[model samples]
Target: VGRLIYTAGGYFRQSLSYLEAYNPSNGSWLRLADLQVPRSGLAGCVVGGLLYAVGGRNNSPDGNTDSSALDCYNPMTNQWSPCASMSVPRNRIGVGVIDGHIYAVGGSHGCIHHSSVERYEPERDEWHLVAPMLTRRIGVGVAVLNRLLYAVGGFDGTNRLNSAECYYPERNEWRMITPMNTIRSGAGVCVLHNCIYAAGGYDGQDQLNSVERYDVETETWTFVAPMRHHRSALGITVHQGKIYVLGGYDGHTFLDSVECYDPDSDTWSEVTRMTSGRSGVGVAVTMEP
Candidate 1:
C-alpha cells in the first residue's frame, strides 16, 4: 500500500531507504540508493513524483557552513539527480510545496538565523527570491494547507520560539498566526484532516515529547497527548489516519525507535524500531485508496 523513500544522517551522502511501500495490503522497508552528499539539517519534499533534498549544514555545527546544492531522487527508477542551487545557503530550514512549486523557508545562513525565503521551480531548474519572513528562525517546521504554507516553532538565535506564521504565495507576504504553547525547535509537522499537527522537538535545555495541534480555520493552538519518548530532529508523516514518528535524538543519543499517534484515542503506541539510530532523517508513506 506504500512505497516511500527517506534520507538518513546529517549529510546527503547517505542511502535512501524504503520506509513503507505498497505490495498490496501492508508495507515494508527496503534499502535503496544512497545520497550523493551526506548532510544534516536538510529539508525534503516531494514534487512531480520526485523527492527534492534541499540545503543543509556540512562539516561543522555552525550554520555558516551550509550549502545551496539541491538533489532529487526518483523512486520509480531509484536514481538521484542534481538540481538548482538556492540563492542563500541555509540549514535547519522548513520546506513545503504549494501549487507544485517548492518553497524554502526560514533557516540559518552560516552562523546567523535568516528570515529569507526562496522558491524552486523544477521545470526551469532554478530558484527565485520571495518575500522574507517577519521573524528570523531556524529548525522550523512547515506544512501546506488550503494553498497556504504554515511555518511553525523554531530557534531564533538566542532561544527557541513559540511563534508561528503563514505565507501567501499570491501576495508574497507572511502573516502571524497563533503561537505554540511551548518554545521549540527541530520539530516535525504535517497536515491531517485539514488540521496541522506538530510533534517532538527540543526546547533548548532538553529534548521534548510535547505534541500540539493548530487549527488553521480557527487560528488557535491546542495541546495534545505527548510522545512516550523525548526526541528532536525526528521524521513525522501521516499513514492512513495515524501519525508516524521516526528516529531522532533524546539529547543523550540517537534513537532507532518509531511511534504512532492515533487522534481518535489521543494516545501513542510503540511501533517498529528503525534499523539505525539516527537524527535529522526524512520520512514519507504510500497508501492505497
Candidate 2:
C-alpha cells in the first residue's frame, strides 16, 4: 500500500489532507494527519525521511499578498518544525532531490520570475547556490532521473514555455532537452519504469488534460493519453506500479479528484476524491516493506 499527503485550500488559507487509503481486501479511504500550516502554492519534496514544505503566496479574495514561509514535517512523529528560510521566497517553483540534496528551482518572486536554483543540504542544515536556469520561469515541473535533474514546461513573465532542460551535478551545469508538445505551467511530473511522465497543466488561455512521456534512454518525448479533466498544479507520484495524480485546479475551480494511471494498459481510472481541493501542492510516496 502507498499514501499521498497534500494541501487543500485556496490562495491564502489552506489545509493539508491525505487521500483515502484503500485495502486490497476492500477499497476505502483511511484518514491521516493534517498540516500545521494551511497555505496554498507551496513546494513539496521528501529527503532524508523528512518532507520539506517550501514557499507559497498568501492571497485573500480581497487582494493581499502574504508569502515567504518554510516548514518541515516528519510523518513518524507527526511533528512540524521550521527550516532555513529561502533567500528569495517564491511560489509555484520546481523542486527535486538529488544525491541527498534538495533543489528549489525557478519560481516567481512577487511580480518577477526567477532562474535561480538553490541547493538545500540536510547534512549541513544549510542552502547553497548552484547553476541558474537559462530562462526566468515559474510554475515549472521537475524530476530527477539517474542523478540528472530535469526542469520542464513553465511560464516566463509574459508567456508559457514548452522548452525543457536538464541539470548535471557533475559539472554543475544545465543543458536543454526536448521541448514539451504543449506549452503550459504548473504541471505535475514523475519517473516510473525509467521514463519521465509530465501530466496536467495550463496554457495561458485554458487548463490542459494532456500527458506526455519522455524516455531518458531514447532521449525523446512522446504523447500519452490525456487526463480525464483539465488540471494544473496537481501532485503526482508513482506507487505500487501505478501513477497517481492528486488534487489540482481546473480553470474555474479547485478539485479533489484523484486519478490513477496504469502504464501496462496505457489507461487512466478515477479513484476516491481527496478531502481537500487545492493547487500548487507537494506529494511524496514511501517505498518500504
Candidate 3:
C-alpha cells in the first residue's frame, strides 16, 4: 500500500525513493531526498518511534529490485537507513507491529503471491519467517483484533476473495476466520472498539462503496453503512473515535476524497477531501510527544 508518515505540522510520503514531506496544515509538500530504493506496494509501520518501510517493487520494474529489504526513517534527523531484508520480497502487504516486532504478512512477489509471513526484530536486526496463511493471497487487508493479526479479502491470482484469516502469534498459527460479506481486493481495513471494519474495494468486477464489520466477540461479519464513493486501494485509520477512509481509485478516476464512519451512529458522511487525487496512500495519526 502507498503511505505517508505524519509528524508535527507535516507528513512524509513515498511511492519511490523520492520521499516527500507535506504540511497539510499550511498546505505545502516539501520534497526531500529519495529513499535507497524507489518502490511501491511496500509495507510500512512504526516500531518504537521510527517508521519502518518493508518489501516492495523497487526502481527496476520487475528486474533489479523486487525487494525483501527494510529501511528505517528517522524523523529526528530526517534520514533513512538500511536495516535487514526479508527472506522474500513482497508488495501489497498487510502489516502490524506488536511485542517489539513489526509483522509483514502476505503479498505478491512479481506474479507470485504467498501466505508466508515475516516479522522484524529491531533489537537483533534480523528477520524471522513465521507461520504461513491458510490461503495464498495478495492485496489483503490486515489488522489486529483481540491481539491477533487478522488477514482479510484478497486475490489468490485466479479469484477475488472474501475469505479472512487470523494469526495468533502466541500459538504461531493461522486459523480461518469469518470472511467478508463481499469479495474484494485492496479494501481498507482497521479496528475500532473491538470490531474490524472492511471498506470500499474492487470486487474483481467493479469498484465498491460497500462496507462491513467483523465482531471479535461474535466471530462473525456483518454489513455496515456504505461509503459515499466507490473506492479501492484506499488508506484507513481511526481518529477521535471515528474511522476515516482516505483517497483511492474508483475504477474510473483517482480520488482525493475522504470519508468518516461513526461506529455508534452507524453512519457515514463525506469529510474534507485531500488536496491531491491518488490511490493506495496510507493515512494515519500520531500523538504529540
Scored by lDDT, the top model is 1
Worst 10 residues of 2 by lDDT: 16-25
lDDT of 1 by residue, 92-126 (tens): 88888898898998888766898889999899998
Worst 10 residues of 3 by lDDT: 3-12
Tens-digit lDDT track for model 3 on 170-262?
Answer: 899999987787998988888888888899889988989999989988988888989999998877776667887877788777776778898
Off-target runs (Cα >4 Å) in candidate 3 are 1-34, 59-65, 287-289
Give lDDT per model, in order. Answer: 0.77, 0.75, 0.74
TM-score sort, best first: 1, 2, 3
| Inter-residue clash pairs, candidate 3 | 3-282, 17-34, 17-35
| Candidate 3 RMSD to the real structure | 4.4
Model 3 misses residue 271 by how many Å? 3.5
TM-score of candidate 1 against the unseen true structure: 0.90
> If ranked by lDDT, best first, what sequence of candidates would result?
1, 2, 3
lDDT score at residue 121, model 1, on the 0-100 scale: 89
On residues 1-289, what C-alpha lDDT tens digit does candidate 2 reach at each position? Answer: 4444433223414433332233322445544445555556666778876777776665555553434555676666666687777778777777889988888888887887989999988877788889999888798888998999999999889889988899999999999988888887888888878888899888777888999988988888888878897899887776678878877889777887888899989998987676556666677654221
